[PDB]
Amino acid sequence: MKGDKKVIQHLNKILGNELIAINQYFLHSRMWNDWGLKRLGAHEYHESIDEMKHADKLIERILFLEGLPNLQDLGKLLIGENTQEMLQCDLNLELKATKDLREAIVHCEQVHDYVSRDLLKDILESEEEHIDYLETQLGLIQKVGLENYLQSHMH
Amino acid sequence: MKGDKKVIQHLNKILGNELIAINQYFLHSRMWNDWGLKRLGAHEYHESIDEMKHADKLIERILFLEGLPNLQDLGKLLIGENTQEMLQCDLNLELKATKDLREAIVHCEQVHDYVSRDLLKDILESEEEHIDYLETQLGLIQKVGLENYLQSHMH
Amino acid sequence: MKGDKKVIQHLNKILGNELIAINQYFLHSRMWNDWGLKRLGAHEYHESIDEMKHADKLIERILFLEGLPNLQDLGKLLIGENTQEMLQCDLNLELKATKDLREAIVHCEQVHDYVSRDLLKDILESEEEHIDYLETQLGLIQKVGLENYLQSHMH
Amino acid sequence: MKGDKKVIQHLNKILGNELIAINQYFLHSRMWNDWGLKRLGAHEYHESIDEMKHADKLIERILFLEGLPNLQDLGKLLIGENTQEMLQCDLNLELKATKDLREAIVHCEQVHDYVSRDLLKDILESEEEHIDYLETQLGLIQKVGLENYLQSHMH
Amino acid sequence: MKGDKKVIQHLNKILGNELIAINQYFLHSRMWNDWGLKRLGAHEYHESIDEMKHADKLIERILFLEGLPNLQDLGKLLIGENTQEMLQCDLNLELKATKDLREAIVHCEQVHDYVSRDLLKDILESEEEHIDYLETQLGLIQKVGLENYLQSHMH
Amino acid sequence: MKGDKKVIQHLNKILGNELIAINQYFLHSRMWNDWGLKRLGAHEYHESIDEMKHADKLIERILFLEGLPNLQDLGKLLIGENTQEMLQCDLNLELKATKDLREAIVHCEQVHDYVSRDLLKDILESEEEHIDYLETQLGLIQKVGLENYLQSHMHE
Amino acid sequence: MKGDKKVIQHLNKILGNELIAINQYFLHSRMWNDWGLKRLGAHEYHESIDEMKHADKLIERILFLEGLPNLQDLGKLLIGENTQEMLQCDLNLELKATKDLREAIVHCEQVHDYVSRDLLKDILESEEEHIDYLETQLGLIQKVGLENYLQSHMH
Ligand code: HEM
Ligand code: HEM
Ligand code: HEM
Ligand SMILES: O=C1NC(=O)c2c(NCCCc3ccc(O)cc3O)cccc21
Ligand SMILES: O=C1NC(=O)c2c(NCCCc3ccc(O)cc3O)cccc21
Ligand SMILES: O=C1NC(=O)c2c(NCCCc3ccc(O)cc3O)cccc21
Ligand SMILES: O=C1NC(=O)c2c(NCCCc3ccc(O)cc3O)cccc21
Ligand SMILES: O=C1NC(=O)c2c(NCCCc3ccc(O)cc3O)cccc21
Ligand SMILES: O=C1NC(=O)c2c(NCCCc3ccc(O)cc3O)cccc21
Ligand SMILES: [Fe+2]
């Protein structure tokens, strides 16, 4: 079904954000596992898988709309060097992602692509839940202390 | 455990090949599904998942060896425009991948990194199975005709 | 609950499109069954049932909003006389239907009937899935040839 | 139990034919599998297995009759270079095999070795069933065309 | 996939050894069964089947590498005339087989055919387990006496 | 089946390292259990059992190759006096062990004893897994603090 | 709990005996398996495991009593060169072990370490059962002859 060109460009930009997130969260996951912080590693792994699922749906929608999904361009990964930095890197990435989602939804609404809007809204709900998780973890580090926070994520 | 620097470089090169394959096979899968060739779409999806699993193990090994896994650089995806071209693109990528795996195995053997060799050997077995599949599909197109071949991959 | 008069007119227009679709798809289903193309017959039957379910929800919404559902004024059926034409007739009907759904959603949004909008968005998602199916079937006929396409839908 | 010398010689000739057939059918099976024609590969594998079972019974009978089973001498394998030729090569081998079985049964009857006759009759029934299968496949190639026939044996 | 010509020669030489062993072990098995030494017969039957499985994998690999598997040439069977001789004939064949396997592995390693090497290493592990079995049986005959050794293999 | 004399010497050297590890890890396990650090005690017990299983496979291989497995000579146990030292002693032992395993594989390959090489590669994989565990534990002590690290290994 | 210095010395002497026995029985076990006397190998394996469990309890008791368990000093293994010698070597070791156990119990009794006495008594019961087994096997060799005795321990 012939999609609006600018909708497809928005979907490719959201996809590009998801492709960064997949790799950033997967590396953070495996770093935490290597450091023995296996509960963080497992949670971050599921965050990476969630972004893979979103990327799949975006690719499928782009192709239905007769666009070309862009899996070739990969933007800058934000890789931290300790647990606090890694969480902040994820949060910075997620805040960019939700800003971009809001702009894409505006445009879908304007051209009456209500099904693309509904998909992006579902993705936005997932990303806001990730922001909630990340903000909460950074808050917990302040409340229980970094050593206890890390201890609680060993097993 | 402090790994050999050139082993880590080889492992990052193999990882780079897997990251290309993940995206190339995932997009090819979703194109085939979009076109109604769901048996090809499903099989290509499982190829992409297998490359994801290989990339996971490579990332884990690099970190254990105290290297930095490179998930930032993404090489050229080879995307075809019809089924025959897509299969040939996959095959061309796999032949590059198995060349690079053989050079990495040589270097692991020379520095006595036998565990990394064993991992790469397992990955090479998977990639040669993929080559078998691909060559066979291209041969079947010649034996049964393209229309029959595509028909056989609809459902 | 007293609904907006023009919303109710839009809902009756969407209902009228669904009523056309029920009959068009049911007849196409039974034609395909009579011709021995039972997989097309079964799939087209399920498309008719899904339109019956949408019509039900639309009737229920109109009555809630204190309007009169119009089941009397049946528009023009697009009945094909061979498989490719029947698929194209369904596609043409669906493209008219999604155009009408988008205009109805615009009006629901403008008068703040957000529950009617959500119902229509759900119907639109189903209709775009039907468009995806239909475009894919027409593309398959081009890729595998008509004789093979029909063969694959006998059983 | 001391058997008739010429019976044992007949049994060793039949065994020689079965030994050719085991290897010919096994190679043809693995060629078809390599070419992606897995239904042919599997069926031909089961034909090879059946000849292995016949060879076992012949070896066992020869030994009971105080003869020496000849597993050293292997006659000429008839290997085809495409599906049609491979089937005709199997059929040519089978027609020689059933001629030899008949001449062996005649001799068993003449010297009153009715148990060896019964064994050979059972093998002959199996080989005639194989002839039926082969003649029928060659007929189907003519009726449905080679491309369809091979297509029907991919999966 | 275009294999190394000399790898294919090595694989065909190992296949030739396995084809000798299939027939030698199958005949020894059926001799032992005929003599009422059914535990030896069963064990030797399973040795024969294991060689059949190795031959299958070798044939499959050769075909994948675009070579011709040689099932026509059959080398000399070493058939014993009593239990001790049959075990020593099996051991003599196995010692030749493992020498040939080591030479094939050297060459696969030198041309970087690491998957062929892995297959041959697995077969070598199986052949060395058979050598352990055989050496052990010959040692048991010395320790418990031939009459007891045979008694222990009747049922 | 007559093995290469130097392969057998290498296999006996690997066996000797495993025999040290069996006893070192068993003692460390029972020390940690006596101190109430039962999660460390249990993990270290499983490390000792794993070395026992490797030793078994090496003994079996040496005998098949018609050598004499040396279970008489026991090298120096590296016994720590606190949790950090015990972990480092295990790590020092494993690093010597993997060095010796690599040299043994080189020689197996040279004389074409590919089955002995495969066995040693499998043991090497287990030993590198143990090194990963040990390095990670030592790093966790620095990230969470010793008191938290020990607390986290009190209970099974 | 602070133990008697001489009790701990006794426990360490008993521990030393158990450490010899672990290794002597494990080696004898694996020798019997290599020779194909698998029932002897299995039984001797279980004797070795039993000594491992005794050593564990002694280690635990020594640590509870605030002593240092000596796992460093390993006494002389008594390795036999045939089945009779191996059994007699085991028996010789066991007779030394039970003498040492009796002297240790005497001393535990004199200083009122009744729990250590109970542990040693349990170990002594196990070692006397092993003596029973060993004396009985040596007697069976005389009664049934070595060849039959070894035959009975093949499977
Ligand atoms: C274009 C980028 C990618 C896409 C669209 C994608 C998509 C997917 C999807 C749809 C799944 C299945 C999730 C489920 O339903 O359970 C999956 C699984 C997985 N992915 Fe990805 N993926 C991508 C990249 C990656 C990368 C770069 C890695 C690793 C470095 C990775 C590692 C994995 C793993 C380990 C699994 C689970 C496989 C299993 O064990 O079942 N993926 N991916
Ligand atoms: C090229 C030579 C041969 C090859 C590649 C071959 C291969 C095989 C294979 C793959 C199997 C199935 C094993 C399993 O998965 O359980 C098998 C079974 C068997 N083979 Fe062979 N074989 C060969 C020659 C022979 C010969 C010469 C004989 C007897 C004279 C024989 C007798 C048997 C028997 C009796 C079975 C078991 C069939 C059953 O009851 O399931 N094979 N063979
Ligand atoms: C300090 C010396 C040793 C101690 C304290 C010790 C202790 C133990 C214990 C407590 C068990 C568990 C038994 C059970 O409850 O099932 C065990 C198992 C075992 N041990 Fe040892 N052991 C020692 C030395 C050895 C040696 C030298 C070997 C071999 C060369 C060995 C081989 C084994 C094996 C194969 C098992 C069975 C593991 C399994 O499959 O679960 N042990 N040992
Ligand atoms: O693709 C990328 N792979 C990377 O590693 C990476 C970056 N590494 C930052 C160092 C993080 C780190 C890794 C392992 C470890 O043990 C400690 C650490 O601090 C930065 C940007 C992009 C990438
Ligand atoms: O990342 C990338 N996304 C892409 O689409 C792509 C490329 N497209 C080539 C056209 C493929 C195609 C897609 C859908 C369809 O319906 C028909 C088609 O021929 C080439 C290089 C890299 C990329
Ligand atoms: O023992 C034998 N092994 C063989 O391959 C063979 C023969 N091969 C003829 C070529 C068959 C063939 C194989 C693979 C392929 O991909 C295409 C092909 O046409 C002829 C006589 C005897 C033997
Ligand atoms: O293919 C072959 N079939 C054979 O029998 C054979 C050979 N026979 C040696 C005699 C073995 C034997 C069988 C039965 C028996 O009761 C006593 C025996 O000593 C030698 C080389 C090759 C072959
Ligand atoms: O074979 C050996 N048995 C031993 O105990 C031992 C060594 N002990 C060092 C002290 C360890 C220790 C144990 C219990 C405790 O409560 C505190 C501790 O610091 C050193 C070398 C060899 C051996
Ligand atoms: O630690 C030790 N390992 C040993 O092998 C060993 C001794 N071996 C004496 C010979 C045993 C033997 C093994 C295998 C075989 O087939 C025949 C045999 O007679 C003596 C003292 C200490 C040790
Ligand atoms: Fe007897």
- Ligand-binding site membership of A51 (annotated): yes
Any atom of ligand 3 within 6 Å of the Cβ of G84: no
Any atom of ligand 4 within 6 Å of the Cβ of B72: yes
Binding site, annotated residues of E for heme b: 52
Any atom of ligand 1 within 6 Å of the Cβ of B49: yes
Asked if the C-beta of D33 comes within 8 angstroms of chain E's C-beta atoms, the answer is yes
Any atom of ligand 9 within 6 Å of the Cβ of G35: no
- In this structure, what are the phi and psi dihedrals at residue A36, rounded to the nearest 5 degrees? 85, 10
CA distances in angstroms from B149 to B140, D154, F129, listed in the order given: 7, 9, 47
Q: Which residues contact G136 (CB under 8 A, 6 or more apart)?
A: none
Any atom of ligand 1 within 6 Å of the Cβ of B55: yes
Helices E5-34 and E83-110 sit at what angle, rounded to 10 degrees?
170
- Ligand-binding site membership of A127 (annotated): yes
Contact between residue G22 and residue G52 where contact means Cβ atoms under 8 Å apart: yes
Does chain E reach chain A with at least 3 CB pairs under 8 Å?
Answer: no
Contact between residue F120 and residue F108 where contact means Cβ atoms under 8 Å apart: yes
Asked if the C-beta of F12 comes within 8 angstroms of chain A's C-beta atoms, the answer is no
Q: Which residues contact C18 (CB under 8 A, 6 or more apart)?
A: C51, C54, C55, C58, C97, C123
Residues in chain F: 156
Contact between residue B131 and residue B94 where contact means Cβ atoms under 8 Å apart: yes
**Separation in Å, CA of G145 to nearest CA in chain F:** 27
Any atom of ligand 2 within 6 Å of the Cβ of D52: yes
Helix (H) or strand (E) holding A88: helix A83-110
Nearest CA in chain A to B78: A72
Helix (H) or strand (E) holding C39: helix C38-64
Task: Kindly give the distance from the C-alpha atom of residue E26 to the centroid of ligand 7, in angstroms, as a whole number.
Answer: 12
Determine if residue G66 is left, alpha or beta; phi over 0 gives left, psi from -120 to 50 gives alpha, anything else beta.
left
Task: Kindly give the distance from the C-alpha atom of residue F35 to the centroid of ligand 8, in angstroms, as a whole number.
Answer: 13
- Residue B82, both tokens: 């019809």
- Ligand-binding site membership of B33 (annotated): no
3-state secondary structure chain D: CCCCHHHHHHHHHHHHHHHHHHHHHHHHHHHHHHCCCHHHHHHHHHHHHHHHHHHHHHHHHHHHCCCCCCCCCCCCCCCCCCHHHHHHHHHHHHHHHHHHHHHHHHHHHHCCCHHHHHHHHHHHHHHHHHHHHHHHHHHHHHHHCHHHHHHCCCC
For chains A and F, CB pairs below 8 A equal 28
**Which DSSP category does E147 fall into?**
H
Contact between residue C152 and residue B155 where contact means Cβ atoms under 8 Å apart: yes
Atom of ligand 8 nearest to the CA of F81: 19
Atom of ligand 8 nearest to the CA of F35: 16
Which amino acid appears at position E17 of this protein?
N
Specify the long-range contacts of residues B7-11, CB closer than 8 Å, at least 24 apart: B7/B65, B7/B104, B7/B107, B7/B108, B7/B111, B7/B113, B7/B116, B8/B62, B8/B65, B8/B67, B10/B100, B10/B103, B10/B104, B10/B107, B10/B108, B11/B58, B11/B61, B11/B62, B11/B65, B11/B67, B11/B69, B11/B104, B11/B116
How far is the C-alpha of F117 from the C-alpha of F108, rounded, in Å? 6
**Which DSSP category does F72 fall into?**
S
Which of D21, D102, D117, D103 minimizes the C-alpha distance to D65?
D117
Residue whose CA is at the smallest distance from ligand 6 atom 7: D79
Question: For residue G148, which residues of chain E lie inside 8 Å, CB to CB?
Answer: 144, 148
- Residue C61, both tokens: 């919404």
How far is the C-alpha of F125 from the C-alpha of A127, rounded, in Å? 39
Q: How do the residues of chain B divide into helix, strand and coil, expressed in percent and rounded to 5?
A: 80, 0, 20
Q: Point out the residue among E64, E112, E114 whose CB comes nearest to the CB of B132.
A: E64
Atom of ligand 5 nearest to the CA of A73: 1
How far is the C-alpha of G8 from the C-alpha of G12, rounded, in Å? 6
CA distances in angstroms from F134 to A152, B3, F55, listed in the order given: 19, 16, 21
- Residue E62, both tokens: 């050769």
CATH number at residue D91: 1.20.1260.10
Which of C101, C104, C92 minimizes the C-alpha distance to C124?
C101
How far is the C-alpha of G4 from the C-alpha of G8, rounded, in Å? 6
- Residue C72, both tokens: 């009397």
Asked if the C-beta of F106 comes within 8 angstroms of chain B's C-beta atoms, the answer is yes
* Cβ-defined contact of F114 to E132 (cutoff 8 Å): no
Radius of gyration of chain C (CA): 17
Contact between residue F108 and residue F123 where contact means Cβ atoms under 8 Å apart: no
Asked if the C-beta of A45 comes within 8 angstroms of chain F's C-beta atoms, the answer is no
Which of F134, F129, F123, F126 minimizes the C-alpha distance to F90?
F134
How far is the C-alpha of C47 from the C-alpha of C34, rounded, in Å? 17
- Residue D16, both tokens: 């020689």
Contact between residue F8 and residue F61 where contact means Cβ atoms under 8 Å apart: no
Contact between residue B66 and residue B2 where contact means Cβ atoms under 8 Å apart: yes
**How many contiguous H segments (helices) and E segments (strands) does chain G have?**
5, 0
Instruction: Please give the residue range of the domain that contains residue A58.
Output: 1-155
Burial of G60-86, coded b for 16+ CB within 10 Å and e otherwise, reads ebbbebebebbbbebbebbbbeebeeb
Q: How do the residues of chain G divide into helix, strand and coil, expressed in percent and rounded to 5?
A: 80, 0, 20
Q: Which residues contact E147 (CB under 8 A, 6 or more apart)?
A: none
Asked if the C-beta of D114 comes within 8 angstroms of chain E's C-beta atoms, the answer is no
Whose tokens are 């934000």? That residue is A78
Any atom of ligand 3 within 6 Å of the Cβ of G68: no
Helix (H) or strand (E) holding B45: helix B38-64
Contact between residue D38 and residue D155 where contact means Cβ atoms under 8 Å apart: yes
How far is the C-alpha of A125 from the C-alpha of C36, rounded, in Å? 47
Whose tokens are 């297998």? That residue is B50
Determine if residue D36 is left, alpha or beta; phi over 0 gives left, psi from -120 to 50 gives alpha, anything else beta.
left
Which of F9, F28, F1 minimizes the C-alpha distance to F103?
F9
Determine if residue A7 is left, alpha or beta; phi over 0 gives left, psi from -120 to 50 gives alpha, anything else beta.
alpha
Asked if the C-beta of D42 comes within 8 angstroms of chain E's C-beta atoms, the answer is no
Task: Kindly give the distance from the C-alpha atom of residue B48 to the centroid of ligand 1, in angstroms, as a whole number.
Answer: 8
Residue whose CA is at the smallest distance from ligand 1 atom 41: B49
Q: What are the DSSP calls for E24-52, one per residue?
A: HHHHHHHHHHHTT-HHHHHHHHHHHHHHH
Q: Point out the residue among E143, E149, E151 whose CB comes nearest to the CB of G35.
A: E143
**Separation in Å, CA of F11 to nearest CA in chain G:** 15
Please give the resolution of this entry in Å, rounded to 1 decimal. 1.8
How many domains does chain B divide into?
1
Q: Which residues contact F104 (CB under 8 A, 6 or more apart)?
A: F7, F10, F11, F13, F14, F120
Question: For residue D147, which residues of chain B lie inside 8 Å, CB to CB?
Answer: 143-145, 148
Contact between residue E30 and residue E87 where contact means Cβ atoms under 8 Å apart: no
Among A45, A52, A70, say which to mutate for ligand 1: greatest number of ligand atoms within 8 Å of CB.
A52
Asked if the C-beta of B150 comes within 8 angstroms of chain C's C-beta atoms, the answer is yes
Which of B21, B22, B6, B44 minimizes the C-alpha distance to B96?
B21
